[model samples]
Target: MEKLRIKGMSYTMCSGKFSIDKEMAETQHGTTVVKVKYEGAGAPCKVPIEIRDVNKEKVVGRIISSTPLAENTNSVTNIELEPPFGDSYIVIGVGNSALTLHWFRKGSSIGK
Candidate 1:
């Protein structure tokens, strides 16, 4: 299941909030490379990301590769995605980019 699942949500990796200020991406050789910009209450944070196929309504992203999202002041973090091997993908950074917000929040968590 999605680590950041919710009804109609935008980027905010690590629980960091939104302002998808800017972004760009491309698909190639078993992967999709992306670079995104974030602003406000959301900068400098684990940078959890998700990609989806809006047309087919399915998640199409997996195992985020190295990207200095946490280091860049959220100005523009680079991302490497070995995606779901689909025809297309939509990247969504789903948390705070801050390590603190994501630590211990991984894996499937059921009800308390």
Candidate 2:
């Protein structure tokens, strides 16, 4: 079930929203890591994240619950992903007032 909203911002832009950095996605041993960046909106909030395989088209993994971002500043947070190895993964960050999503290949970028 999707959380309904009114007059929402685009999920592809990162300027005043939440985004996951695909260029930093790395896998070693059993865990893959990527950086999650957020441009604060003057109030503290949590951004929920979920990962899915691009081809498989299902929820394959996700970051832990409740990643917090402080007010009026920029931040870099880390999320470790451990799902069955796949070529491309889609990272979705659902924030209180903004949203973002990105397609990330392990060694390169995917999607615009």
Candidate 3:
């Protein structure tokens, strides 16, 4: 298994693009969920994101929350899969803030 980590500013949203393996895209169904953790100063803010196809024209899934931020120092947010298309690149839009993203395989065990 592999883990990907990304760091960004707070109070702003940042999005990264990822290519799904052809095999996985064909085999998997529904949306993929990403577990995100916010660091740095100020209260934890909500992170908005969307999933789109390769063309970047269609919106598959979007974070459905008006205020998804935490009021503590160390806060985390879990964005679930939205609608439209399945298995595609993701576009994460933060709510007037930035955040750190840690992406990992959904159901894989860490080590044996």
Candidate 4:
């Protein structure tokens, strides 16, 4: 493969595709709510959000952007998962292209 030129460009290309900040809370009925704050450069791109059930080993919930996240603008969205919260994973992207991985637990706190 004669792709040496493209090989060296990987480093720079791996920089901030987007950045994420999130807040979480538990509902009275034991559901978990996630508030995702997305911020990125001034180019609109659809951001995918998924909730993976650790015990089930599959995606139990998903959120699709009705519109692309506008560049340089801060936006917020909410993801709610029903009871039996237990422990789970918050996947900000899809397979092989995930940007951020977050672990969550219900009814208790853990050190980061």
User: Tens-digit lDDT track for model 1 on 1-112?
Assistant: 2433341233244455433443334343545445555544533544555555536356655645653244334456566555443343344444333221111111111100
Q: What do the candidate models score in CA lDDT, each in turn? A: 0.42, 0.46, 0.38, 0.45
31-109: candidate 3 lDDT, tens digit per residue: 3445555443434343445555546566654444333343333555554444443234454443234221222233322
Reference-based TM-score, model 3:
0.42
Which 10 successive residues of model 1 have the least lDDT summed?
A: 103-112
User: Which 10-residue window of candidate 3 scores lowest in summed lDDT?
Assistant: 18-27
Q: What is the TM-score of each candidate against the true structure?
A: 0.46, 0.52, 0.42, 0.50
RMSD, every candidate, angstroms: 13.8, 8.8, 11.5, 10.1
Question: Which model scores highest in TM-score?
Answer: 2
After superposing candidate 1, which stretches have Cα over 4 Å from the reference? Answer: 1-13, 17-28, 55-57, 72-74, 95-112
Show where candidate 3 strays beyond 4 Å: 1-31, 39-41, 62-73, 83-85, 94-112
* TM-score of candidate 4 against the unseen true structure: 0.50
Better-scoring candidate (TM-score), 2 or 4: 2
Residue 55, candidate 3: alpha-carbon lDDT: 64
Across 1-112, the per-residue lDDT of candidate 4 in tens digits comes to 2323333222222122444455556556555565544444443334455667765367765333232232223655555644234566655534444444444445433300
Alpha-carbon runs more than 4 Å astray in model 2: 1-16, 55-57, 62-73, 95-112
lDDT (Cα, tens digit) per residue for candidate 2, span 1-112: 1223221222222234565544344455545566656654533334445566666457776543234332223656666655445554545344343343444445334432
lDDT winner, 1 or 2? 2
